[PDB]
From a paper:
Luminal peroxisomal proteins are imported from the cytosol by mobile receptors, which then recycle back to the cytosol by a poorly understood process. Recycling requires receptor modification by a membrane-embedded ubiquitin ligase complex comprising three RING finger domain-containing proteins (Pex2, Pex10 and Pex12). Here we report a cryo-electron microscopy structure of the ligase complex, which together with biochemical and in vivo experiments reveals its function as a retrotranslocation channel for peroxisomal import receptors. We propose that the N terminus of a recycling receptor is inserted from the peroxisomal lumen into the pore and monoubiquitylated by RF2 to enable extraction into the cytosol.
To elucidate the function of the peroxisomal ligase complex, we determined its cryo-electron microscopy (cryo-EM) structure, using Pex2, Pex10 and Pex12 from the thermophilic fungus Thermothelomyces thermophilus, which are highly homologous to the corresponding proteins in Saccharomyces cerevisiae and higher organisms. A cryo-EM structure of the Pex2–Pex10–Pex12–Fab complex in digitonin was determined at 3.1 Å overall resolution. The density map allowed model building for all parts of the proteins, with the exception of some loops that were invisible and not conserved in other species. The Fab bound to a cavity formed by a cytosolic loop of Pex12. The three Pex proteins form a channel with their transmembrane segments and a cytosolic tower with their ring finger domains. Each protein has five transmembrane segments, most of which were missed in predictions because of their hydrophilicity. The transmembrane segments of the Pex proteins form a channel with an open pore. Because this segment comprises only five small amino acids, it is unlikely to occlude the pore, leaving an opening of approximately 10 Å in diameter. RF2 sits right above the pore, suggesting that a recycling receptor inserts its N-terminal segment into the pore, so that RF2 can catalyse monoubiquitylation at its conserved Cys. The wall of the ligase channel consists of a single layer of transmembrane segments and contains small holes that are plugged by phospholipid and sterol molecules, with the hydrophilic head groups of phospholipids facing the channel interior. In our cryo-EM structure, the predicted interactions of RF2 and RF10 with E2 enzymes would lead to steric clashes, indicating that both ring fingers need to undergo a conformational change to become active.
Numbering used by the authors:
A (entry chain A): 6 to 42, 55 to 139, 144 to 197, 202 to 241, 257 to 279, 294 to 352
B (entry chain H): 4 to 9, 22 to 43, 48 to 85, 96 to 117
C (entry chain C): 20 to 97, 127 to 169, 201 to 247, 276 to 300, 323 to 351, 358 to 452
D (entry chain B): 56 to 138, 153 to 279, 298 to 341, 379 to 484
E (entry chain L): 2 to 10, 20 to 106
The structure:
């Protein structure tokens, strides 16, 4: 029986992460058409985009008003834990500077370093030694963060390890239904769960096909793919050059066609169509059986 | 001036066939075949399929098929469609 | 006893989220200090330990769990009377440790009863459905249905120790759960009118009301094939008799010699001898059937958590 | 402290719902046309403008009575005149400007996005397709060419500027630096606030003074839940679940006199009626068949056999010394294992790129 | 395949077996001379062609109209249809 003093901070961090994600999504939409006409530019510069967004947020939210958007939504604010008393001192400039360096800059630099270490893997003794040292550093930080979270469960003062080290603490500057809606979401969740449990039982693919028929061997259009690529994988992913995701594994050939797919893909489709043959995607013919690929020998 | 002077050799002058489509059409009009130099895409008609092998070299700006007209394909912008500008 | 069922449900969901995140952190640490194989080996133990830690820093000390804090609930004993140390410790022992011990001990009891039935003196129905019947998922579902109707004790162990929730038309969930359980029973009864593996090192949890992760789960957690012989006939794949498997490493140490060491000759999923070894795209070898079931459930390698597509699993030869 | 300031999360969710509405209506219209391709086909072909008109009417009605847009009202939000209730109310000109921003700008953005996305495949098709029209072409031809040039060169920049200005105003709005969360709200001098108790009372009283409002607000809830629960993806995954299959198989697996036997054992290639060189199966399992030694860096080819990684790599590339020694006196008359599995001799689709580095 | 039939063998009419959208062009073959493009789209007049030639469409029926036939306009008028790719098919040709 004590007033809430931890959920506010947990919610503050969750909201900060959500905000960065949303702004990153806006940047993705901005770069949607740039670079030709996939991930493209936005995926290539994910780390740089995130660094820029985090720097702008830190300047606008933490540096200027001593509270991350999300800490402000919860009526919290960063305070100098070193200075005691009801005065509720603001953080010093050095505290904010170090918080920024570790949170906006340090994260980016560490991501770049780890990516570079992964690239060097293919490696040099120096690369192996550096990888070992950085794995040790990351493990040490992971242990420290876990222990700080366990302590936060007890006392609820410092949410993060960096906050504990810098002595910046989230406190409510001033006093300044929301439950009925969530209790309704419970019923929505239960009903959608029931639907997800029920529909597969009656068979939703078969009923969907019948509903499509009720409501409403020329060459197929995937012949352009190289022999490496599985047409089923290509269709189901890119709903060219062979990649790791679409390559044929366990090549099986359709009995009449001779076109090669993965064993799992071809068998699953031929079984989905039951007796009716599945139409090939490379030459359009109808397939009812498959055999292990002869592999270009007699 | 774009001139297209005609193993039958077709030499293109005034433009580079690396960045165009070359269509061979014979008359006894029947479209024989077309070739895209950039991607190497080539297609023929049923009558000439197989017996006729077409290609082109950019270095001397020439197209080989192995009266016959060569024309430059032109893809319109308004209601995009394929026409043949600069016959022969 | 002055607490509504939806508030208790939401508090439990948030507690489950925090227990799951603690377990994820612990499993990540285990995988950093030792290989992913050992981290996966102790996934269930780590999850139980994470739940026990969460309830040993919040409840065992008399504090309120983060889930209770979110929903403005106080755990009293039948606030007017907060539970004593003995009650809280007993509840933690009965709600987390006891289910794990029972789960660990269940396979032996199942095998003993299986042999006893196999010695004969409706019984064949028990023999073919012993595992579903002796699993605790359905008892937990019954507890949840009784809770959704009465709205008193979310867990069976809070009734034993008499712990209720105090502040500071949701029988639909119970109706849906009862219908789901009845349909599940009917499908098995109608016939005569795989392995779970549990989760791996990482379990998905979320604080969103619309997440559809494990913690946001109201109803029960838990045919279209052709017997694996007809599929082989269609695909011209010679299918060996059930149980018998091509290239089973338990037959001898010379079945696949390049796999050396008893640690490396057992799949991490079923823990038995590697039979029909199959390499995921990332390179890790499991039984064909085990990894097939796993990627059916979660499209992800159980060890390195890399993406695994069921179509790109390669049997070894 | 300033209650009635919607959080950026609320505003972004409301905008997501407003953006979800038009594709949803289009999909429903497409289905209904599929049923009756007689009366609704004309509507579907000119959907964008008719949806714009319907949205104009609906949003105008909601602005005049509820004070905010349809989805904004669904979220408890209203639109006030940034600068008492009369002074902050929306005048008719303000209602028309709000309609222009709510309905005009999204309509134009959808038109431009659709045009660009329809033109993109031709843009990337090549240079044979993208030949500028010579002068003297009909004005329609030149206009279409310039429209495509705009869509290809200028429009990506305009889209980036649009989204980046929205992002800048969101960032400024976060901490009361802007008072507007969107540049177009800034232009028309309107700000989205959170409805208070008085506004709800006024709306309820006006409703009382006068079966579609409940049905339209339960449709919004259902749409929001459909897209937030990711229901389509979950149902697809449940339907397109993995099938319980048996393990695959490979077809190959279960002194001139020597040359005849060697040809006899070798599998003859298909493209050329020519034998293929294949190494014998090892005597013991723990041995690379190529080098006949201990397997050091296990790697599996497309056939599932496991070799040393360097050994099988060289064998696929056709450079392994075992191949060259066997290919010295048998050039032409034999086919090496180049691009083939060493043991079975079956061709390998991925060549060397498709090798599994087995983590034992 | 798509069949392109010209009824005559002035308003020259032509018809297509299926719906070819608007991708139909007209060429002018003079005796012993290369064809000259007239209307590359259904109605887009090629540069340099006199305005007397006009192209029109109605569903699957295309028409080439010459308001005032000129003494040098005598030739064979060929209809051509191309698919999305560069697959073309000509007509029979109409002599005027
Ligand atoms: C169900 O199957 O589909 C769902 C619910 O279907 C709906 O409920 C749609 C209704 C939306 C109506 C919103 C506008 C309300 C305007 C009223 C104005 C009243 C103002 C009155 C004053 C004049 C929607 O999803 P979907 O259709 O299945 O699409 C999924 C497939 N795609 C899109 C992913 C491809
Ligand atoms: C050089 C010595 C390190 C300097 C401190 C900074 C760069 C470090 C050390 C350990 C790092 C982090 C290690 C692992 C993770 C999880 C991942 O989501 C990225 C950030 C995070 C949380 C690191 C961020 C920074 C970080 C805290
Ligand atoms: C009470 C309301 C909400 C639901 C009523 C139907 C429920 C109980 C559902 C759940 C599982 C369903 C069964 C799933 C499997 C099949 C096979 C298929 O060929 C349709 C019939 C049949 C036999 C279904 C009958 C209806 C069923 C029993
Ligand atoms: C009210 C909503 C949420 C419940 C979902 C509708 C369920 C109950 C519907 C959807 C499909 C329906 C079934 C469709 C076909 C059959 C086969 C018949 O031999 C028994 C009933 C059965 C199996 C339907 C029963 C119900 C049923 C399962
Ligand atoms: C962050 C982690 C390491 C905290 C450790 C305490 C928890 C997680 C428990 C649960 C299961 C436990 C392990 C059980 C068995 C073994 C085998 C041996 O190797 C000793 C430790 C080991 C591997 C346990 C270590 C801890 C351990 C993992
Ligand atoms: C508060 C405490 C009891 C919470 C639970 C602690 C966990 C880590 C304990 C409870 C039961 C313990 C295990 C009990 C017995 C065995 C035998 C052997 O197979 C290895 C360890 C094992 C399997 C225990 C491991 C840990 C372990 C799982
Ligand atoms: Zn085929
Ligand atoms: Zn495939
Ligand atoms: Zn196994
Ligand atoms: Zn793996
Ligand atoms: Zn070797």
């Amino acid at each position: 029986t004590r007033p809430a003093f931890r959920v506010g901070q947990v919610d503050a961090e969750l909201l900060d992460e959500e905000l960065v994600e949303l702004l990153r999504g806006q940047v993705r939409e901005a770069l949607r058409y740039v670079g030709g006409g996939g991930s493209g530019v936005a995926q290539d510069w994910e780390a740089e985009i995130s660094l820029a967004l985090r720097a702008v947020l830190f300047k606008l939210t933490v540096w200027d008003h001593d509270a991350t958007y999300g800490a402000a939504l919860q009526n919290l604010k960063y305070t100098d834990a070193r200075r005691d008393g009801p005065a509720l001192a603001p953080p010093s400039r050095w505290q904010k500077a170090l918080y920024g360096l570790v949170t906006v800059g340090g994260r980016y630099l560490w991501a770049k370093w780890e990516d570079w270490l992964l690239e060097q893997d293919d490696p040099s003794p120096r690369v192996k030694r550096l990888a070992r040292w950085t794995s040790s550093l990351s493990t040490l930080h992971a242990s420290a963060a876990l222990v700080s979270f366990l302590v936060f469960l007890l006392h609820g003062r410092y949410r993060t390890l960096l906050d504990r080290l810098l002595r910046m603490r989230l406190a409510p500057p001033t006093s300044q239904v929301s439950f009925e809606y969530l209790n309704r979401q419970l019923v929505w969740h239960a009903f959608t769960e029931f639907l997800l449990f029920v529909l597969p039982l009656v068979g939703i693919n078969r009923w969907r096909r019948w509903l499509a028929r009720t409501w409403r061997d020329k060459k197929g259009e995937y012949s352009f793919l190289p022999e490496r690529t599985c047409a089923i994988c290509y269709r189901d992913q890119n709903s060219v050059v062979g990649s790791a995701q679409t390559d044929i594994t366990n090549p099986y050939e359709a009995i009449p066609c001779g076109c090669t797919y993965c064993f799992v893909c071809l068998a699953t489709r031929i079984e989905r169509e039951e007796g009716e043959g599945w139409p090939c995607l490379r030459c359009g013919e109808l397939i009812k059986e498959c055999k292990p690929w002869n592999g270009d020998v007699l | 001036e774009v001139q297209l002077v005609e193993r039958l050799s077709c030499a293109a002058s005034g433009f580079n066939l690396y960045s165009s489509s070359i269509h061979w059409v014979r008359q006894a009009l029947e479209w024989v075949a077309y070739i895209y130099s950039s991607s190497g895409s080539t297609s023929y008609a049923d009558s000439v399929k197989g017996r006729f092998t077409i290609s082109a070299d950019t270095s001397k700006n020439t197209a080989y098929l192995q009266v016959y007209y060569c024309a430059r394909g032109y893809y319109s912008w308004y209601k995009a469609s394929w026409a043949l500008a600069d016959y022969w | 006893p002055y607490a509504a069922a939806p508030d208790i449900i939401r508090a439990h969901q948030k507690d489950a989220y925090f227990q799951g995140v603690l377990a994820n952190r612990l499993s990540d640490l285990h995988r950093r200090l030792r290989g992913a194989r050992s981290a996966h080996a102790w996934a269930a133990e780590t999850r139980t330990f994470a739940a026990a830690l969460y309830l040993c820093l919040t409840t065992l000390l008399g504090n309120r769990t983060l889930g209770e804090e979110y929903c403005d609930l106080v755990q009293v004993e039948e606030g007017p009377l907060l539970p004593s140390l003995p009650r809280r410790a007993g509840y933690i022992l009965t709600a987390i440790v006891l289910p794990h011990l029972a789960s660990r001990a269940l396979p032996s009891v199942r095998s003993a009863i299986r042999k006893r039935l196999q010695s004969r003196l409706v019984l064949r129905y028990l023999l073919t459905h012993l595992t579903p019947l002796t699993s605790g998922a359905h008892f937990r579902a019954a507890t949840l249905a009784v809770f959704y109707f009465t709205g008193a004790y979310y867990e069976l162990s809070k009734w034993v120790w008499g712990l209720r929730y105090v502040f500071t038309g949701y029988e639909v969930l119970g109706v849906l759960l009862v219908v789901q359980m009845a349909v599940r029973a009917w499908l098995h009864v109608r016939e005569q009118l795989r392995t779970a593996f549990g989760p791996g090192t990482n379990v998905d949890v979320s604080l969103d009301e619309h997440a559809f992760t494990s913690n946001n789960e109201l109803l029960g957690g838990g045919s279209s094939q052709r017997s694996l012989g007809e599929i082989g006939a269609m695909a011209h794949t010679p299918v060996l008799k059930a149980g018998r498997a091509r290239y089973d490493l338990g037959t001898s140490d010379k079945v696949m010699g390049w796999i050396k060491g008893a640690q490396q000759r057992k799949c991490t999923l079923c823990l038995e001898e590697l039979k029909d070894p199959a390499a995921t795209q990332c390179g890790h070898v499991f039984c064909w059937a085990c990894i097939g079931d796993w990627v059916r459930e979660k499209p992800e390698c159980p060890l390195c958590r890399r993406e695994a597509m069921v179509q790109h699993i390669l049997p070894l030869r | 402290i300033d209650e009635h300031k919607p959080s950026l999360f609320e505003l972004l969710s409301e905008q997501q719902l407003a953006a979800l509405l038009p594709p949803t209506v289009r999909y429903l219209l497409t289905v209904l046309t599929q049923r009756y391709p007689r009366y609704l086909l004309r509507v579907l072909n000119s959907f964008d403008e008719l949806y714009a008109l319907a949205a104009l009417v609906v949003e105008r009605h909601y602005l005049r009575t509820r004070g905010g847009s349809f989805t904004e009202h669904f979220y408890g939000l209203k639109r006030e005149r940034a600068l008492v209730r009369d002074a902050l109310r929306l005048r008719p000109a303000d209602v028309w400007r709000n309609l222009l921003v709510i309905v005009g700008v999204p309509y134009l953005k959808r038109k431009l996005d659709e045009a660009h996305e329809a033109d993109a495949p031709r843009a990337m098709m090549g240079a044979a397709y993208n030949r500028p029209p010579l002068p003297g072409a009909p004005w329609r031809e030149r206009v279409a060419f310039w429209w495509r040039c705009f869509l290809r060169r200028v429009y990506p920049a305009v889209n980036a500027a649009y989204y980046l200005s929205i992002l800048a105003f969101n960032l400024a709005y976060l901490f009361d630096n802007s008072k507007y969360h969107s540049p177009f709200l800034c232009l028309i001098g309107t700000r989205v606030r959170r409805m208070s108790a008085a506004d709800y009372r006024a709306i309820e009283a006006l409703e009382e003074r006068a079966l579609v409002l409940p049905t339209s607000i339960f449709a919004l809830k259902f749409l929001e839940w459909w897209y937030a629960s990711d229901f389509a993806k979950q149902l697809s995954r449940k339907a397109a679940e993995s099938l319980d299959l048996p393990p695959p198989v490979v077809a190959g697996l279960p002194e001139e006199e020597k040359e005849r036997r060697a040809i006899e054992r070798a599998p003859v290639s298909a493209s050329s009626l020519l034998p293929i060189y294949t190494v014998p199966p090892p005597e013991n399992s723990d041995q690379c068949p190529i080098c006949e030694g201990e397997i050091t860096t296990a790697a599996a080819c497309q056939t599932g056999i496991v070799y040393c990684y360097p050994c099988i790599h060289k064998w696929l590339t056709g450079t392994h010394p075992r191949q060259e020694k066997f290919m010295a006196e048998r050039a032409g008359k034999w086919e090496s294992g180049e691009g083939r599995c060493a043991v079975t001799g079956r061709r390998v689709l991925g060549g060397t790129e498709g090798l599994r580095r087995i983590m034992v | 395949d798509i069949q392109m039939t010209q009824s005559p063998s002035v308003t020259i009419t032509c018809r297509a077996s299926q719906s070819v959208s608007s991708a139909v062009a007209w060429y002018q073959q003079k005796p012993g001379k290369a064809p000259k493009l007239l209307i590359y789209s259904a109605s887009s007049l090629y540069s340099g062609v006199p305005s007397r030639f006009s192209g029109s469409r109605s569903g699957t029926d295309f028409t080439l109209t010459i308001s005032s036939l000129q003494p040098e306009d005598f030739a064979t008028y060929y209809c051509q249809q191309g698919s999305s790719l560069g697959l073309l098919t000509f007509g029979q040709g109409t002599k005027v």
